[PDB]
Design a protein around this ligand. Structure first.
Ligand SMILES: [Cu+2]
Ligand SMILES: [Cu+2]
Ligand SMILES: [Mg+2]
Ligand SMILES: [Mg+2]
Ligand SMILES: [Mg+2]
Lengths: 157, 155
């Protein structure tokens, strides 16, 4: 699949956190994404386990049941961020966290993701995902909510 | 880990059934307590090559909902029923449940696998699927069931 990377990936808590963007998409169920015709991009968080991930994920596996909030700010604009929540979904290249976003024209932007673990109060998927805690098959506790930032230049795609 | 027959290949996925000792899980109060169970039953679901829903080969298939039915051969005739829950363990993510069985002997195991958009799937409002030409994938598989036979001896 064809995508545009936003900066360089960041490694935190045995996970690789990468930011990418593409053209606005169409998704099932309908009515969750902002219509493709009213958006500029599909913003995406690519989260995969690294070697020796402490939550039992083999290397390169998708990290599931996370909750991602984003804030996008145009450099030299109003000063008010474009905010939203991502949603977990699958595309031709595999599962990810994404959202159709309307930007504020060509320019430099700051992108911030707030990544919530599966047990966070803010994560709506918390009652649906568990973690083994016994000695023989258990894993380490979940990481705590954290934020990651990148810069990028948007020209129009 | 103890196997429940042979894995079955359906709708671009490998579906395998296994069991091991009852486990402990966070959040507490979802699993039947390890001390009140005989086994932890699992559904191991991974994508095959050319999976029609965009999953690369060997990837875990997420946001599924699995219902199981376990009936002891020669017993009452009434199945032990339940819902599995998605979780992670040292060997990776899977769908599992702590289960109390009815003694050693032969059992029939049936899993009903619900796609992410099924009415019965409680995770349906939280998982999407791209449908556009450039990044889209094929529609979800329809709900299906898989069965195996196994002999239970214990621990
Ligand atoms: Cu997406
Ligand atoms: Cu389990
Ligand atoms: Mg991608
Ligand atoms: Mg214990
Ligand atoms: Mg296993």
């Amino acid at each position: 699949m064809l995508e545009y990377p936003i900066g360089t990936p960041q490694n935190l808590a045995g996970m690789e956190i990468a930011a990418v963007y593409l053209q606005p998409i169409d998704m099932e169920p309908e009515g969750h994404m902002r219509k493709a015709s009213e958006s500029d991009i599909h913003i995406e968080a690519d989260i995969h386990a690294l070697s020796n991930n402490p939550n039992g994920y083999p290397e390169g596996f998708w990290v599931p049941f996370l909750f991602i909030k984003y804030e996008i700010t145009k450099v030299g604009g109003s000063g008010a961020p474009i905010t939203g929540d991502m949603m977990a979904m699958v595309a031709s290249d595999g599962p990810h966290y994404g959202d159709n976003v309307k930007l504020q024209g060509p320019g430099k932007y700051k992108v911030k993701y707030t990544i919530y673990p599966p047990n966070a109060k803010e994560n709506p998927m918390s009652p649906y995902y568990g973690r083994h805690t016994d000695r023989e098959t258990g894993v380490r506790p979940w990481f705590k909510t954290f934020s990651v930032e990148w810069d990028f230049t948007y020209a129009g795609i």
